[PDB]
Ligand binder design. Structure first.
Ligand SMILES: *CCC(=O)N1C[C@@H](n2nc(C#Cc3cc4ncn(C5CC5)c4cc3Cl)c(C(N)=O)c2NC)C[C@@H]1COC
Length: 279
């Protein structure tokens, strides 16, 4: 049985579990309705995302979900991160309540808007990058290293707010889960297992390339065995089609082999804010 943190505890009568969200990208996650989550509207059912355990979960799986919830409380709230809203810990299965992102992950959001009425403008793409950088600046200030920053791990709300997901979790190269995470890893993280805020900056550069390719996959047609060689030789992805020079230089600064030569997330927020101001 779990200890109760009263300020975060939600009554089970206020929660109605709904349909599963996607598959197992972020674990066993379902859509749900929570009455009274919004303070201004006490009776309004608010759609939330609930992370829970499988029916045959181990003691390790439970401790993992508890540590994830406790790390969420420690990091704190920010507009551009997926926030903790509450939990049901007493008298039943553990349910961790999180903000719901109606428009799914950033990769699919971008791929769907490659044409038509909702086709994203150049300014909209810079705004997406700026919001991800702002959320990463907050996580770096809170001593949190994401270790897998990618468009798949950024969620988009009904109001088009970018929210970084899968940050407080606890953490082969030829294998795939429908994605090859190696294509987002910095050389020092890939070859030496070294993770820092500057390795997340490299991943942000790959995420920028994903934004300006409108949800394209990095290093097209390159097997992972050849990627190791190409990164040591100093090769980088080409400029996305239709991308400006200034934004490609930001991507190239993120991909410096020397980690301290890459910009900080504070510097990236300033660089992307300057691009939004001009154009
Ligand atoms: C495989 C599925 C897929 O492609 N999906 C799922 C869908 N989705 N996922 C989320 C979520 C979440 C989330 C994020 C976390 N980061 C850390 N933690 C732990 C507490 C520490 C969590 C827990 C969870 Cl539940 C949502 C959401 N939050 O609304 C959604 N919404 C659709 C996105 C994507 C489908 O894209 C089209």
């Amino acid at each position: 049985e779990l200890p109760a943190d009263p300020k975060w505890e939600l009554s089970r009568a206020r929660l109605t579990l709904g349909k599963p969200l996607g598959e197992g990208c972020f674990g066993q996650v379902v859509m749900a309705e929570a009455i009274g989550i919004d303070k201004d509207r006490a009776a309004k059912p608010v759609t939330v995302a609930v992370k829970m355990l499988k029916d045959d979960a181990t003691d390790k799986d439970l401790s993992d979900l508890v540590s994830e919830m406790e790390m969420m409380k420690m990091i704190g709230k920010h507009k551009n991160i997926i926030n903790l809203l509450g939990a049901c810990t007493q008298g039943g299965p553990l349910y961790v309540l999180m903000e719901y992102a109606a428009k799914g992950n950033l990769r699919e959001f971008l791929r769907a808007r490659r044409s038509g009425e909702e086709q994203l403008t150049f300014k909209d793409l810079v705004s997406c990058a700026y919001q991800v950088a702002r959320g990463m600046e907050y996580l770096a200030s809170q001593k949190c290293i994401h270790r897998d920053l990618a468009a798949r791990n950024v969620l988009v709300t009904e109001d088009n707010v970018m929210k970084i997901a899968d940050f407080g979790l606890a953490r082969y190269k030829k294998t795939t889960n429908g994605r090859l995470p190696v294509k987002w890893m910095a050389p020092e993280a890939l070859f030496d297992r070294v993770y820092t805020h500057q390795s997340d900056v490299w991943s942000f550069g790959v995420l920028l390339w994903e934004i300006f390719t409108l949800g394209g996959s990095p290093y097209p047609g390159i097997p992972v065995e050849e990627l190791f060689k190409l990164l040591k030789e100093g090769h980088r992805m080409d400029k996305p089609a239709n991308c400006t020079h200034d934004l490609y230089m930001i991507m190239r600064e993120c991909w410096h082999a020397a980690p301290s030569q890459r910009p900080t997330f504070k510097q990236l927020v300033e660089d992307l804010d300057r691009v939004l101001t001009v154009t």
